[PDB]
Each structure stands twice: as structure tokens, then as C-alpha cells.
Amino acid sequence: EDLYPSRQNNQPKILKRKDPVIYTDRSKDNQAPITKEQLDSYEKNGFLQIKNFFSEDEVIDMQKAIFELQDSIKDVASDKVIREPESNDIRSIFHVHQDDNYFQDVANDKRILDIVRHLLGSDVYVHQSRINYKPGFKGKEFDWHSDFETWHVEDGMPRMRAISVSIALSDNYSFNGPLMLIPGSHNYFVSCVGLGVPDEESLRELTRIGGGISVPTGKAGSVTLFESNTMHGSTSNITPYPRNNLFMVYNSVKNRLVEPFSGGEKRPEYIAVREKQPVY
Amino acid sequence: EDLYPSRQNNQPKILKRKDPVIYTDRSKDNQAPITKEQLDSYEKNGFLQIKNFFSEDEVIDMQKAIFELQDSIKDVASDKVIREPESNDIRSIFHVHQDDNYFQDVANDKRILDIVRHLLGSDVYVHQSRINYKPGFKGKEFDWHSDFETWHVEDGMPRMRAISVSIALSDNYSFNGPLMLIPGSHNYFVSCVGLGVPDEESLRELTRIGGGISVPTGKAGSVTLFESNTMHGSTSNITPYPRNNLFMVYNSVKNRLVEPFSGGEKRPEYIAVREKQPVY
């Protein structure tokens, strides 16, 4: 049963969300690790920024850890390690939540799990992880998209029951190509043409409904959580201020991947997790 | 005598500014139409934003006027009128300060003249004017540059004694590709390689000296004045919020153009004014 068909024709359409946003009853706000106000802001906007999530030592430790890993894998040949063609410089590393002990501990951090389990109303597992290295002046624009539309079409994610967690590992300014989100857009599924980038008309409609464009900013260490279907994008960075980050996607154990809704072949494990965690 | 050589080799260098910034004595701040604080902010940063420069009716009148002119010239064949190749839609119109009565009155507005004459310490004339039409989702990134470096090399402007005046005719947000400036950068001349875009190393050095990147924002009608040599640029606009503007450059009558410092041919009048205004 495909509740969110996309890329099946050349006519875009906006379909209504058929899933809860916050899956734990609001009568149980007292059990959450965040406030009623934070819960309401997530429900309404489709994302939540939390500043001072980590202590200053934890921030510095994480920043050192990404560059220590980058140096440690300089000679590695792996499809998980994305390199710039000309320099061979490492731009991204996938699947660190599983492959490295330090990043596994970050991915299992109770402060993160307590939130995502509350919001998703179940236990969770990591769908994907990635470290991004984005030096000053690097990283092209990313057109607006819903992660969900890709997870669904290409990876077989059935329902809107996953949350992305972005840890800023550089200071996040308005001017260096920050993540931008359309508030409220998680309530609307944009079918895309027969890739996965919505048309301008749909984007205008979402922006009108949301009242604008949201651009969280903050010091290194700040955390942005965003719902699976929240529309987001970024401009290029023409400034010397980098944009390094650690990205993890938490999916409900009740929403495990099936075959790609496109009818196509599975993507690699490092892109979309199909491991079911063993008893031992 | 070339005080600011550029594009003559392939080694960039930073040369010191050899001209005043504010050409009227600071002992005469009382004669200016702006405050000591505004004067100091211009001197330090190389730009000044003024919100509520125009009354609300004047803002609405100017917005209507750009689109009335755009419609009036739909069938025109002119090198002053810049059109998108595919749609033929009008993206810019040069030389309105001279060619249209309404835009001439804007260019002669006493509120603008009183400021630029104070800052340039002399009478002024308009070097260039342009209306830009930048609908939602349109207008590519503009790499960092100093207008002065172009005016000098290509148009024969001798010294740093011109000011650009940008009137926002759309709301100016942080997220839709606003003008960004490097504060303090007007004090440093970046020679460019043998076009006119400075190298990353120089840009890092300016940004370090300035302490960051400045991005004025404000409602339609807000005015940004910037010194001839202030480094500025913008990202692309991936949002539906337009960026229409009226841009005028005021040059001191003591700094009239000579032959291009490149040794090349003059550009057209609509790009760089060489008319000396007649007595009648």
C-alpha cells in the first residue's frame, strides 16, 4: 500500500500527511525530556533547534574527533568515504554510527534518544549517519527537498515516522549556506515528477502556508532536529566560515524499510539501514 | 599615475587605501544630515544602512514605477535593457537616472545628495544607474568584488571617491540572496589577477580584519550606501521572495573618469558616465 506516491507522473500534487507528528499522546507531555513549548514548536514547525545541548568540552571533543577520523582514513578505499575528484579530499563519511566506537556513543546518546523516542512514540534505530566536512568556500547549493520523499521512493520507508538530527560542528551563521527549512511543511507531501526535487509552484504554496522561511543559527554544538518530511535546502557558501556537521537519522522500529516504492533495487546499507539489531 | 594597479600580473596583493573615506572634516559633523554615530559607522565599516529613509507612500510609488517602466518598454530594442535569453523577460534597465523623469527625480533626491556630498566632500554626478528585477528563485550568485577595482581598471576611475546607493524595492531578508559586505574592507585594495574577482586568500584576510561578514536586512525602502571599494557579494536566491532594487552610483566631480587603467577601450555611456553636465 503506497500512501505517498511520487515520481509516477509529470504532474505535481500536494497530498495531506496521513501520520501523526508527535506520536506520544500530548496528555503525556510530563514524560518528555523537553517542555510543552518545545513540543508545541516541533509539532507546529516540523523542526526544533536546541542550543547548549552539549557541554563545551563535548563540543570540542566532537570537533577533534571528526578531524582525527578524517586523518585516520586518509588512505582508505571505501564507497562510504566521499572524496572530491580533483584533490581527493574527504567531504563525507557514511555509517560512522556503526563503524566507529566514538560515533556510536554519540548516536546512542541518551539526551538524543530520549527526545526521538518520545516524538516517534516507540523505540528507534539509526537509518543513516554521516559526517560532512564543508570547508570555507566549499559545498554547492542544495535545492529544496523532503528527505521522506527520497526515503520512501528510493529506500522503502513506509510512513513519516523518522527524525533527522543535525549537530553543528562549526558556528552556524545566516550567511554561510545554513540549513533552511519551510515551517509547517512536514504536514504536506509534495509528489515530485517522474529527481525528487519539488516544483516552484509547490514551494511557493508551502512557503505561503508556513508564513516564511526558517533559518536556525547558533554556535558549534547547537542541535537541529527535523521531521522526515520537512522541506529544507541551502545556498552555497561563498565565505571562509565552514559548515562541518554530524547528521543522524532515527527511524521508529515500527517503520522499518520494505522494498523501494519506486519498484527499483535497494540502495547500499551505508545509505539506508536494513540490519535488524542482533540479540547479543 | 596608477595608484591602484590591478590585473597586470598573476600574483594578488593587498595595497593600502591612499584616499580619505570621509572627505569632509570631522570637525564639520554638525553640517552633515546624519549623526556622528552614523558617520563613524560608515567610516569604520565602509557602508551605512538607513531604514525608514523614504515614507510609505514613496516606497509604494517607487515599486509601482519600476513595474510601470518595465511594462512600457516591453517592445524596446536597446542595449540598456538586459533580457533573459530564453523568456525575453527584462532583468535590468541601465541609465534611468537620465532617461526617465521619475527616476531622475529619485537620483536627485536631496536626502540622498546631502549625504553623498558630505561624505565625498564635493559636488557629485551619477556614474551609473540601474533597476534590477530579480523575481523569486532568480538571479545567480555574485562572487565577491570591489566595484572600485572594475571602475578603475575598466572605466578609468582614478581614486576611491564614489559611493553606491542601493534602494531595496523588495523586503530584504537574510535568506534570499541579500547583499553581503566585508566590514572595513574599503581600507584595502585587492589587486586581482590578469576577471576582477579577488582570490580566497585575500578574502580570508579581509574577513579576519573585519571581524566577520555584514548582511543588512530590512523592509522595502531601506537604503544601503557603500563606499566604492567595499568588498561585496551575494548568494543565489532559492526562495520565492524577490529582490528588486534601484542602484545608483554617485561620483565626486573631482574624480571624473579618464582612460581605462587597463589601457583598453571605454565602455558605453550606460555603464560608465563620461557626460559633463551642460550649463543649460
Residue numbers in the entry:
A (entry chain A), B (entry chain A): 2 to 195, 211 to 296
Could you pull the original sentences from the published paper?
Here, we focus on the ectoine hydroxylase, the enzyme that forms (4S,5S)-2-methyl-5-hydroxy-1,4,5,6-tetrahydropyrimidine-4-carboxylic acid from the precursor ectoine through a region-selective and stereospecific hydroxylation reaction. The EctD-mediated hydroxylation of (4S)-ectoine to (4S,5S)-5-hydroxyectoine requires O2 and 2-oxoglutarate as co-substrates, thereby forming CO2, succinate, and 5-hydroxyectoine. The catalytically critical iron is coordinated by the side chains of a conserved H×D/E…H motive, the so-called 2-His-1-carboxylate facial triad.
In addition, the crystal structure of the EctD protein from the salt tolerant moderate halophile V. salexigens in its iron-free form was solved, thereby allowing for the first time an assessment of the structural consequences of the binding of the active-site iron on the overall fold of the ectoine hydroxylase. However, after analyzing the iron content of this strongly overproduced EctD enzyme preparation, it became apparent that most of the isolated proteins did not contain an iron molecule; the iron content of the EctD protein solution dropped to 0.1–0.2 mole iron per 1 mol of EctD, rendering the enzyme largely inactive. Upon addition of Fe2+ ions prior to the enzyme activity measurements, we observed that the activity returned to levels observed before, indicating that the missing iron catalyst in the purified EctD protein can be restored after the protein has adopted its native cupin barrel fold. The cell constants and the space-group were identical to the structure of the iron-bound EctD, suggesting that the apo-EctD protein crystalized in a manner similar to that found in the iron bound form. After solving the new crystal structure of the EctD protein, it became apparent that the iron ligand was lacking, as evidenced by the missing pronounced electron density that is present in the iron-bound EctD crystal structure. Otherwise, the apo- and the iron-bound forms are almost identical, as indicated by the RMSD value of 0.34 Å over 280 Cα atoms. In the V. salexigens EctD protein, the iron ligand is bound via interaction with two histidine side-chains, His-146 and His-248, and the side-chain of Asp-148. Interestingly, in the apo-structure of EctD, two water molecules populate the iron-binding site formed by the 2-His-1-carboxylate facial triad. This keeps the side chains of the His-146, His-248 and Asp-148 in an orientation very similar to that observed in the iron-bound EctD crystal structure. Hence, the EctD apo-protein exists in a form that is pre-set to incorporate the iron catalyst.
